[PDB]
Amino acid sequence: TGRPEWIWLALGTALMGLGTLYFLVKGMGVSDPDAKKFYAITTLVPAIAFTMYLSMLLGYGLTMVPFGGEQNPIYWARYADWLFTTPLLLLDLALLVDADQGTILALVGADGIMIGTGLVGALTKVYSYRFVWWAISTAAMLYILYVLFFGFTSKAESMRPEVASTFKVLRNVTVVLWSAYPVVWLIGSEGAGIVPLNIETLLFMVLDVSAKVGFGLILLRSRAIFG
Amino acid sequence: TGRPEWIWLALGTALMGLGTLYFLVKGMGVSDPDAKKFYAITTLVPAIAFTMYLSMLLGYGLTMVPFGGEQNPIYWARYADWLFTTPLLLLDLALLVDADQGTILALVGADGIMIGTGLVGALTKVYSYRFVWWAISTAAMLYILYVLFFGFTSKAESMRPEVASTFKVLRNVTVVLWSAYPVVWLIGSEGAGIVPLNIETLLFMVLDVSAKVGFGLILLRSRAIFG
Amino acid sequence: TGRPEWIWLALGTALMGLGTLYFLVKGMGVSDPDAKKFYAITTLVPAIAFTMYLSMLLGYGLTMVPFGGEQNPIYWARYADWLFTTPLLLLDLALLVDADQGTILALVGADGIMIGTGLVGALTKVYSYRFVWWAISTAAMLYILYVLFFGFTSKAESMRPEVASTFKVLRNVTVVLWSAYPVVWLIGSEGAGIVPLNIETLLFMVLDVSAKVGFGLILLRSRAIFG
Ligand SMILES: CC(C)CCC[C@@H](C)CCC[C@@H](C)CCC[C@@H](C)CCOC[C@@H](CO[C@@H]1O[C@H](CO)[C@@H](O)[C@H](O)[C@H]1O[C@H]1O[C@H](CO[C@@H]2O[C@H](CO)[C@H](O)[C@H](O)[C@H]2O)[C@@H](O)[C@H](O)[C@@H]1O)OCC[C@H](C)CCC[C@H](C)CCC[C@H](C)CCCC(C)C
Ligand SMILES: CC(C)CCC[C@@H](C)CCC[C@@H](C)CCC[C@@H](C)CCOC[C@@H](CO[C@@H]1O[C@H](CO)[C@@H](O)[C@H](O)[C@H]1O[C@H]1O[C@H](CO[C@@H]2O[C@H](CO)[C@H](O)[C@H](O)[C@H]2O)[C@@H](O)[C@H](O)[C@@H]1O)OCC[C@H](C)CCC[C@H](C)CCC[C@H](C)CCCC(C)C
Numbered sequence A, B, C: 001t002g003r004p005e006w007i008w009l010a011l012g013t014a015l016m017g018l019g020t021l022y023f024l025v026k027g028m029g030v031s032d033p034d035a036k037k038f039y040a041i042t043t044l045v046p047a048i049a050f051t052m053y054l055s056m057l058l059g060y061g062l063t064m065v066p067f068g069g070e071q072n073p074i075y076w077a078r079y080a081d082w083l084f085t086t087p088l089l090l091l092d093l094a095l096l097v098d099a100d101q102g103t104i105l106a107l108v109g110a111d112g113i114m115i116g117t118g119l120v121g122a123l124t125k126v127y128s129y130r131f132v133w134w135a136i137s138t139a140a141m142l143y144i145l146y147v148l149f150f151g152f153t154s155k156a157e158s159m160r161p162e163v164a165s166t167f168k169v170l171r172n173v174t175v176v177l178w179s180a181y182p183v184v185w186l187i188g189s190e191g192a193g194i195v196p197l198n199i200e201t202l203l204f205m206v207l208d209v210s211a212k213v214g215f216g217l218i219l220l221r222s223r224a225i226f227g
């Protein structure tokens, strides 16, 4: 349940919070209309993360699901968070690399399903079924990382070296990080309880802050966001 | 409840699933940026349909509402599905016919209300009230079919004959199909139980697959989607 | 609970309803593509307000939350309403003043959090915690009114006098009205029950109709919406 992992939630809330502050206090006097978009998209990611992390800390984002012949502590707020933050991150990559509206739409769709599926899985009562939803969700995820890796990289090659390189870093960071989530989910309390909610929460915490604050940092501190 | 209609759900899940596969395996090597958009929008429709049909089959999308002095089997997942798939379909028509942003916005709004209202109706406990929500939802629907029929057709007349004709087919197919839903809802378990959930599910199944896979087929196999 | 304030809900439902009708019956024969957008955005605001007000009147939008060592009557539908209507209103201001996509995105984000936070607050069981969420929600709100007041006004100064002035009126009306909500929430049943749900409902009613129908009226009856 929620108590031993109260601390990881606390640190997460705080890190996202400061992350918002730092990104907010930096894009204040930014004239560049394109850079303006990047700060907006990027800043909104940690801000949302902050509200959802606070709901877990205060006990709201946590619920109980019966499965495995018992009651289970499921932090649902993660899906509420990700549902918006993942597309926003994706949007950042698309703008940076000037992707086609079609692909953005396809990418956003894939993402919504990825989280939608993950959320449903996290709540389904037939233990067994939770793993099907996981399968679907991961399939959706993989599609995204594919397009990002082979599709987006290609589009980056046409931009100026600054953008190509920043994208390369961002690309590597999201591909590697995003794929850890399904592994954590799988071995955590949402799936086979191989790992305690204690460590799991510390894991999502590190992954989230990296995948958002870190990503924001890499992106917002490069000249790539400028026209 | 969910058992006698388990089969229609199963076939639906499967048909949507293959529908996604087929549309996915066809727009792979498509350079045309406009055609790319059409495949994205269209492909996402059956994909969502698949996840929601699977939730009904696995028992998740089903809930119980007390009304009529008794418990009632309400597949809520349909609204979760439609909420996204109906606008997407609408968006397809708008792109094809190059509609004004204003009308798209108005059309999307109408749709969200149409489903939002339908969902609320499906869940309201005062039997009587379910019919008011139905009224509102249908009113919203009618507005949409109106704009599609008289507004969009007009905009199609300015496109090349290929587009005008494909739109005509699509227009006829959506106008006729969409209007069956409110009739099914009305006579099914959501309203006056004149028809059993058994047949009702077989009905939504046929309507959905036609309105999505069929629509996708008609659209994605014409040269209308190209610039 | 829901009974003594049944009337304010009834009048609200009716006022929004007519508000939709009036805005609908006025933008019918409007060729101007820009004006078309304004009518669409603006008309959808009261229309949504109508469906949510009807849910409160019919008893659906009302729920019960335990806090303060007792059961509490919480009209949740307000958040469902606002979640969409507030951005739409914001979008109106942005179009009118031709704001940057970045700022619109930032503004929409802030708003979603503002309502999301408000909703969570309205539902949190630890009385005490409801006030933190209020704090966050208001902080988000303030950010919005700031950008609207100092940012948007600046952008209005570049438009023709008609637009600058209409915006000025709209700006003053939203800044003043929006800031009353957090005060009402604070002193109403969602926070410290200093004011009865009776008067509270009459308050939100006046604020809503003004902030939407009034706003719509001021905007839709000026030549500012034309190109
Ligand atoms: C952009 C649009 C305008 C989009 C729409 C966005 C929105 C709708 C997304 C929602 C997304 C999904 C993923 C989240 C929902 C998950 C869902 C399955 C879980 C829902 O449950 C929580 C919900 C309601 O809370 C509850 O109220 C009901 C009514 O009164 C009750 O019937 C429920 O039981 C109650 O649940 C709570 O309490 C439970 C407590 O039980 C226990 O009690 C015992 C008593 O002895 C003891 O105390 C135990 O300890 C205790 O646990 C608990 O178990 C439950 O979990 C629950 O807490 O909550 C509503 C959440 C709200 C929707 C979150 C919003 C997220 C943030 C703010 C979003 C910011 C987004 C903006 C929009 C982004 C903008 C950028 C774009 C432009 C890209
Ligand atoms: C784009 C944005 C980023 C937009 C936001 C999208 C999202 C928020 C939309 C939601 C839309 C609405 C329409 C769906 C919600 C309907 C709502 C009224 C119904 C909610 O209930 C289900 C919800 C939660 O499940 C539950 O968990 C709670 C917390 O722990 C519990 O308190 C509930 O009770 C529990 O409910 C389940 O179980 C019930 C079981 O009871 C019974 O138990 C007995 C025991 O003996 C026995 O077993 C009985 O047989 C059994 O029934 C059951 O009755 C309930 O129905 C329920 O199953 O679920 C969350 C669903 C999730 C939000 C669905 C998402 C849909 C898909 C994946 C969307 C893909 C969308 C992308 C975004 C599209 C992209 C394209 C655009 C760009 C255009």
Ligand SMILES: CC(C)CCC[C@@H](C)CCC[C@@H](C)CCC[C@@H](C)CCOC[C@@H](CO[C@@H]1O[C@H](CO)[C@@H](O)[C@H](O)[C@H]1O[C@H]1O[C@H](CO[C@@H]2O[C@H](CO)[C@H](O)[C@H](O)[C@H]2O)[C@@H](O)[C@H](O)[C@@H]1O)OCC[C@H](C)CCC[C@H](C)CCC[C@H](C)CCCC(C)C
Pocket: B063, B064, B065, B083, B084, B108, B109, B112, B113, B115, B116, B117, B119, B120, B123, C044, C048, C051, C059, C060, C061, C062, C063, C064, C076, C079, C080, C081, C083, C084, C087, C088, C119
């Ligand atoms: C654009 C996208 C495509 C975006 C997605 C939009 C959508 C998902 C947004 C949702 C936003 C949030 C803010 C609203 C949800 C708030 C949430 C916390 C509250 C949820 O509860 C209500 C929910 C389900 O109702 C219930 O069914 C469950 C399953 O069967 C049950 O388990 C619940 O208990 C049940 O709750 C009801 O009944 C309770 C009754 O208890 C009591 O019973 C006793 C008996 O003796 C006695 O009778 C008592 O008097 C009685 O009270 C009650 O307490 C509960 O409150 C509840 O009524 O409802 C689903 C609502 C639906 C999602 C509202 C939609 C809003 C409108 C139509 C939106 C129009 C939007 C379009 C999209 C805008 C377009 C423009 C853009 C382009 C900008």
Ligand SMILES: CC(C)CCC[C@@H](C)CCC[C@@H](C)CCC[C@@H](C)CCOC[C@@H](COP(=O)([O-])OC[C@H](O)COP(=O)([O-])O)OCC[C@H](C)CCC[C@H](C)CCC[C@H](C)CCCC(C)C
Pocket: A100, A102, A103, A105, A106, A107, A109, A110, A113, A136, A139, A140, A142, A143, A146, A147, A151, B017, B018, B020, B021, B024, B025, B027, B028, B030, B031, B032, B033, B036, B039, B040, B041, B043, B044, B047, B048, B050, B051
């Ligand atoms: C049981 C199952 C049936 C159910 C599945 C579960 C499912 C719900 C989850 C999957 C997610 C799914 C929702 C995703 C939908 C995607 C769909 C909307 C995509 C539509 O398609 C949009 C395109 C975007 O195109 P581009 O990449 O940008 O190409 C640019 C080119 O260089 C030209 O540029 P120019 O114009 O300037 O000249 O997708 C990108 C094109 C790519 C370059 C090519 C991609 C190929 C695919 C990866 C392979 C096809 C899929 C496989 C046969 C199997 C399906 C697996 C599933 C996991 C995807």
Ligand SMILES: CC(C)CCC[C@@H](C)CCC[C@@H](C)CCC[C@@H](C)CCOC[C@@H](COP(=O)([O-])OC[C@H](O)COP(=O)([O-])O)OCC[C@H](C)CCC[C@H](C)CCC[C@H](C)CCCC(C)C
Pocket: B100, B102, B103, B105, B106, B107, B109, B110, B113, B136, B139, B140, B142, B143, B146, B147, B151, C017, C018, C020, C021, C024, C025, C027, C028, C030, C031, C032, C033, C036, C039, C040, C041, C043, C044, C047, C048, C050, C051
């Ligand atoms: C109790 C009730 C009060 C509550 C009602 C319930 C309600 C919640 C459900 C209804 C759905 C509602 C939410 C829909 C909102 C719609 C609103 C946003 C629309 C705003 O309006 C946007 C326009 C889009 O314009 P266009 O069609 O594209 O015109 C192009 C022209 O050719 C010029 O081209 P050029 O620029 O190139 O020169 O709507 C299209 C303009 C059309 C051509 C004309 C349409 C006329 C209407 C159908 C008639 C007006 C309505 C009726 C008086 C009664 C209301 C019934 C209700 C069912 C709509």
Ligand SMILES: *C\C=C(C)/C=C/C=C(C)/C=C/C1=C(C)CCCC1(C)C
Pocket: A082, A085, A086, A089, A114, A115, A118, A119, A134, A137, A138, A139, A141, A178, A179, A181, A182, A185, A207, A208, A211, A212
């Ligand atoms: C907080 C920021 C980000 C980038 C979060 C990303 C989360 C994911 C990519 C989650 C993926 C999931 C999969 C693939 C399947 C199991 C369920 C998850 C939702 C955890």
Ligand SMILES: *C\C=C(C)/C=C/C=C(C)/C=C/C1=C(C)CCCC1(C)C
Pocket: B082, B085, B086, B089, B114, B115, B118, B119, B134, B137, B138, B139, B141, B178, B179, B181, B182, B185, B207, B208, B211, B212
């Ligand atoms: C799955 C694909 C589509 C095109 C589904 C369309 C569904 C509708 C048009 C439903 C309309 C409804 C009305 C008009 C009123 C009763 C409730 C419904 C939601 C069933």
Ligand SMILES: *C\C=C(C)/C=C/C=C(C)/C=C/C1=C(C)CCCC1(C)C
Pocket: C082, C085, C086, C089, C114, C115, C118, C119, C134, C137, C138, C139, C141, C178, C179, C181, C182, C185, C207, C208, C211, C212
């Ligand atoms: C119906 C139309 C509008 C413009 C409604 C606006 C509502 C708000 C600005 C609400 C703000 C809130 C704050 C700042 C904090 C407490 C909770 C609220 C959601 C009431």
